Amino acid sequence: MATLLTTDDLRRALVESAGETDGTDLSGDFLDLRFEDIGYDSLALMETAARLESRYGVSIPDDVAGRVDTPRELLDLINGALAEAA
C-alpha cells in the first residue's frame, strides 16, 4: 500500500509549483491538453516534476521525461511505475 498520484493531486502540484492562475483553468479538462496548452512552461513543468518526486518518493528518468507530451501520459507513467513496486 502506498500513496498513488491522483487527478486532483496532479492538478494541485502544477499550481503549487507555478502559481500561474491567470487565463489557465485546470478546473476542467487538462489531462488531454499538452503542458504548453495549459500554459505551463517547460522549466515550471520540470519544477513540478520535482514536487512529484518529493511527495511520492519517486524519481523521473532523463530520457522518458522529455518523451511525454500530455499530463495524462505523465500520470499514467508514474502510476504504472508505482504499480511495478510491491
From Swiss-Prot:
Question: What pathway does the UniProt record associate with this protein?
Answer: Antibiotic biosynthesis; actinorhodin biosynthesis
Cited Pfam families: PP-binding
Q: Which residues form a coiled coil?
A: none
GO molecular function (one): acyl carrier activity
GO biological processes: antibiotic biosynthetic process; lipid A biosynthetic process
Organism's domain of life?
A: Bacteria
* This protein's GO CC annotations: cytosol; membrane
Residues recorded with modification O-(pantetheine 4'-phosphoryl)serine: S42
Sorted alphabetically, the keyword list is: Antibiotic biosynthesis, Phosphopantetheine, Phosphoprotein
The reply on keyword Signal is: no
Q: Which residues form the Carrier domain?
A: 4-82
Q: Which InterPro entries match?
A: ACP-like_sf, PP-bd_ACP, Ppantetheine_attach_site
Q: How is it modified after translation?
A: 4'-phosphopantetheine is transferred from CoA to a specific serine of the apo-ACP-like protein.
**Gene3D superfamilies according to UniProt:** ACP-like
Sum up the protein's function in the record's words: Acyl carrier protein.
Record's protein name = Actinorhodin polyketide synthase acyl carrier protein
Q: Specify the species.
A: Streptomyces coelicolor (strain ATCC BAA-471 / A3(2) / M145)
